[PDB]
């Protein structure tokens, strides 16, 4: 059986996955600070680094379907939005990215994106969001 | 007026501290990505938060030293800027504190004095390391 080894490995691996997801969202959020071609350039560079080829194509479909960025479920980020970032494990390889959009205002909105993680040769990558 | 001085000074210092935190958190996030796009964001963040004279001083210190004078390091480790602490020192000078290479055997406490100016309600950093 070995409960302690299964438990501590599961806890470690989940925290490693959470760490990558946190790094993606903090890096991606910073790309919204620029208001020129470099904003999109960095945003796409970060998506090329952290997301799989399959998910990036699904994000384009959702960009075409909605009129919002499916990664943040918004058009833009207020500068205080990512300070409320909180990631946690759901089940299996699914994690939930939580943050409050427009915190403090009359348009304050709780955002909750389920994201799925794959490990390729030691590197963690997000391979799906918002289940289809 | 003792109380009005105390309330206005506390409000304004927190607004100045708020801007400095926003600069450092945003600027630190540019290191999470690599290449010309990461550097371009760093420069965009500098344009937003630093004065034209300070950006010219930082470019001089980039040539003069072998470290980024904003962070006093070549790069940032994972979760260095999670230790960020900003406080008022005196007049318009504030101290930015963070632990470089936090958790590692080479961890180093960093303290950067930064001077703030208000230009028509906008807070900008106009000098660092006097």
Expt. technique? X-ray
Residue A121 gets the label, from left (phi > 0), alpha (psi -120 to 50) or beta, of: left
How are beta strands A86-91 and B108-119 bridged, if at all?
A: unpaired
Q: Coil, strand, or helix at residue A85?
A: coil
Record: contact B41-A38, CB cut-off 8 A: yes
Task: Please name which of A26, A130, A17, A36 lies closest in space to residue A81, comparing C-alpha atoms.
Answer: A26
In units of Å, what resolution does this entry have?
2.1
Produce one character per residue of B81-97: b if its CB has 16 or more CB atoms within 10 Å, e if not. Answer: beebebebeeebebebe
* For B49, nearest residue in chain A (alpha carbons): A33
Ramachandran area for residue A2 (φ above 0: left; ψ -120 to 50: alpha; else beta): left
Cα–Cα distance list, A91 to A28, A72, B24 (Å): 25, 21, 35
Task: Residue A28: give its domain's CATH number.
Answer: 3.10.450.50
The whole domain housing B4 covers 1-130
First-to-last CA distance in chain B? 32
Instruction: Look at B29 and A34 and tell me if their CB atoms are within 8 Å.
Output: no
Which tokens sit at A78?
A: 């207020």
User: What's the number of domains chain A is made of?
Assistant: 1
Surface of A (16-55) touching B: CB under 8 A = 19, 23, 26-27, 29-31, 33-36, 38, 41-42, 45-46, 49
**Total residue length of chain B:** 130
């Amino acid at each position: 059986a070995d409960v302690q080894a299964n438990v501590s490995d599961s806890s470690r691996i989940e925290q490693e996955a959470i760490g990558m997801i946190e790094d993606f969202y903090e890096a991606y959020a910073a790309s919204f600070m620029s208001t020129g071609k470099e904003a999109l350039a960095l945003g796409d560079s970060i998506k090329q680094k952290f997301l799989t080829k399959e998910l990036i194509e699904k994000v384009d479909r959702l960009i075409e379907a909605t009129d919002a960025d499916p990664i943040i479920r918004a058009q833009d980020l207020g500068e205080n939005d990512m300070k409320t970032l909180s990631v946690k494990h759901l089940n299996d390889n699914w994690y939930e990215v939580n943050y409050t959009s427009a915190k403090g205002s009359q348009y304050e909105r709780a955002v909750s994106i389920p994201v799925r993680v794959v490990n390729v040769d030691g590197q963690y990558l997000i391979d799906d969001i918002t289940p289809e």
